[PDB]
């Protein structure tokens, strides 16, 4: 509907290949392929992608808007990529990266390690901050969610891994 | 505790409860709580709804109760056989027909009236509605 009306422009150096309901976008960051719902009609008219229903598919505009948003983030990821910034809190909580496997230490009795998926990179400018780069927004969000899940930040001191953008409520141990 | 001060006879038939209601129109006050459902309201339920709605209106305006329970309802004690006569009057009900105006209100905003009537209807066995006094 209202989202599907917004046509996503393809900049220069934006390879868009259609295949029925399979759409692949290649750029300067990387290539991403996603198959779309059968309802979604995606047309590339010489400079843009536009999204519409296929007749006889009831939830057509909703699937169309979802697909439009996904292709928009596909464009963004292939061109200028996505950044997720995670921040640790607490004493000794620290992060390192060995190539593509993050060594987290969060006051556990074992050292934590997350294996990244192929399409992502990570780096740690400081001891407790991690900026992690990628193309696929869903996967980069997923990896940030995993690093946060390793220790979700408590609401009593904010202690634990938090999104850098995140604002955490902090409660108080009333006595 | 609405209950007849005196009554001509001490026990009553079960009777039936069919037909539509008579006290259907908002006649005394300005706002009304009309019963869609067909049942019987014990004086207990009437008093609970009245207390709730009066407290909601903070003792402003006036409240009309357009049902008075006059039918005595009888029950046998526990663990007694079926014969040996009709049971004792344990409480009093007011048979309701669909459309009977259970309650009426004035002196409050329509909004406070709807809210109070809802806080009262939440105490009733039978599903109700908000209605207003209408000219003719």
């Amino acid at each position: 509907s209202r989202v599907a009306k917004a046509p996503v422009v393809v900049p220069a150096g934006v390879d868009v290949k259609i295949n029925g309901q399979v759409i692949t976008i290649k750029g300067k960051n990387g290539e991403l392929t996603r198959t779309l719902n059968d309802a979604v009609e995606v047309k590339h008219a010489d400079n843009t992608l536009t999204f519409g229903p296929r007749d006889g598919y009831a939830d057509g505009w909703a699937q169309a808007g979802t697909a439009r948003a996904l292709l928009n983030s596909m464009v963004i990821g292939v061109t200028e990529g996505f950044t997720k910034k995670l921040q640790l809190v607490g004493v000794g909580y620290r992060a390192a990266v060995k190539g593509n496997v993050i060594n987290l230490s969060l006051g556990f009795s074992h050292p934590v390690d997350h294996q990244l998926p192929a399409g992502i990179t990570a780096e740690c400018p400081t001891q407790t901050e991690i900026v992690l780069k990628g193309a696929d927004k869903q996967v980069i969000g997923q990896v940030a969610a995993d690093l946060r899940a390793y220790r979700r930040p408590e609401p009593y001191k904010g202690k634990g891994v938090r999104y850098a953008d995140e604002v955490v409520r902090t409660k108080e141990a009333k006595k | 505790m609405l209950q007849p001060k005196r009554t001509k006879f001490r026990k009553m038939h079960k009777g039936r409860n069919r037909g539509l209601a008579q006290g259907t129109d908002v006649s005394f006050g300005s706002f009304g709580l009309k019963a869609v459902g067909r049942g019987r309201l014990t004086a207990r339920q009437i008093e609970a709804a009245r207390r709730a709605m009066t407290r909601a209106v903070k003792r402003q305006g006036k409240i009309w109760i357009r049902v008075f329970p006059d039918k005595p309802i009888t029950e046998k004690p526990l663990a007694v056989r079926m014969g040996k006569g009709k049971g004792n009057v344990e409480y009093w009900v007011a048979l309701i027909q669909p459309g009977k105006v259970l309650y009426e209100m004035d002196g409050v905003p329509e909004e406070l009236a709807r809210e109070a009537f809802k806080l009262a209807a939440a105490k009733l066995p039978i599903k109700t509605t908000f209605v207003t006094k209408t000219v003719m």
């Binding site: - | 539509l20 209601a21 259907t24 129109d25 009309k34 459309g99 209408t134 000219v135 003719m136």
Partner: protein
């Protein structure tokens, strides 16, 4: 000012009354004056919305039947005991 479009009743009685009330109409009767009472059927939706205003029961109404106008005034209305619907209306010729 309310102009109400009505039809002359082909058939009367309880059964016909219920049939119209199912079929999105409701009866009424105009009476008064020297002409015999006229039995009409009304479109309940329009009449419901019309009488919503409190002046409906005060002003002088006009009813178009078969391309004839009748000036009346609302005498009495029959409403559903628990529904916001009209059952029947008494109109008195102006």
């Amino acid at each position: 000012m309310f102009t109400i479009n009505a039809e002359v009743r082909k058939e009367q009685g309880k059964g016909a009354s219920r049939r119209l009330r199912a079929a999105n109409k409701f009866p009424a009767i105009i009476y008064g004056g020297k002409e015999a009472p006229l039995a009409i059927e009304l479109d309940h939706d329009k009449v419901m919305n019309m009488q919503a205003k409190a002046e409906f029961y005060s002003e002088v109404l006009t009813i178009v039947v078969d391309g004839k106008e009748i000036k009346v005034k609302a005498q009495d209305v029959q409403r559903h005991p628990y529904k916001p619907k009209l059952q029947h209306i008494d109109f008195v010729r102006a």
